[model samples]
Target: SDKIIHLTDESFDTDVLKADGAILVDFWAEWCGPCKMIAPILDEIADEYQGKLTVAKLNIDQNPGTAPKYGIRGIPTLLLFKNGEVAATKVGALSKGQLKEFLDANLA
Candidate 1:
């Protein structure tokens, strides 16, 4: 089964930016409460949307370079990348249903 891909600054380029299809990158931090709140939700998303989307996670504290490049000033930002570019960005912890809506609107 497919699971969330944990990314480092070094792997971000090849894994997200140069990817084949839609890649949802979750920008999180170790101490962020909301980031922990959405962990399971993101896990579900990764499994359910395995073929349609590639779900990834990047730790802002560990991978400082990548977060700033994407203008991520907030914790738990969700960035959707399509065709090697940023397609959509959501900057907060969202419920599973809310996240599905966000994906549905963008994935189409």
Candidate 2:
């Protein structure tokens, strides 16, 4: 089973920008309630999607630069990246079905 990868500022470019597949990046903070609320959903997604997509989690408080570069101003911002570019974005917490809808529509 696949698990969500935690990314730092140093690894962001190598793991995401130079990666070969579609990645779902979750920009979050430890103190954020919504971020915590959506954590389990993301975990389920990571397992369910498996090799189809990679789930990467970035803590904004720890690695701040990546979020600003992506124009992420919200705590629970979800960015779907494909071939190093942002394909789609969802801000705030969402239901599992809604998240699945977003992924199914944008996943390659």
Candidate 3:
């Protein structure tokens, strides 16, 4: 599953920007409540969208540089990237249906 591939500062550019298909990244930290709240939803999306989209996570505390590079100011930020550029963003917790709709509308 795409969820098995976790992203980090060292692998951010290669795993995300240089990836093969549309990428959905969750910028999160272990201590954030909202981040935890969205974990299951992310997992489900990762599994459901496997092969079509690449779903992954980046630890904000671990990969400090990348998050700020995208102007992220909060935890649980969802960034959808296409051809190495950010195409959409969502902050805070979201339900499965909301996430599905967001991805469906934004991803190509």
Candidate with maximal lDDT = 2
Residue-level lDDT of model 1, residues 1-108, one tens digit each, is 247788999998899978889999999998999999999999899988879998999999888899888889988999999967998999989999999999999998
Per-residue alpha-carbon lDDT of model 3 for 11-61, expressed as tens digits?
Answer: 988998898778999999999998999988888888898787888899889
> What is the Cα-based lDDT of residue 104 in candidate 1?
90
**How well is each residue in 1-108 modelled by candidate 2, as lDDT tens digits?**
257888999999999999999989999998999999999999999999999989999999999788889889977999999979999999999999999999998884
Count clashing pairs, candidate 3. Answer: 0
TM-score, cand. 2: 0.95
Candidate 1 vs candidate 3: the TM-score winner is 1
Q: Give me the runs in candidate 1 sitting further than 4 Å from their true place.
A: none
In Å, residue 12's CA in model 3 sits off its true spot by 0.5
How much is the lDDT of residue 5 in candidate 1? 85
Models ranked on lDDT: 2, 1, 3
Give the 10-residue window scoring lowest on summed lDDT in candidate 3: 1-10
Q: Candidate 2: global Cα-lDDT? A: 0.92
Model 3 lDDT vs. the true structure?
A: 0.88
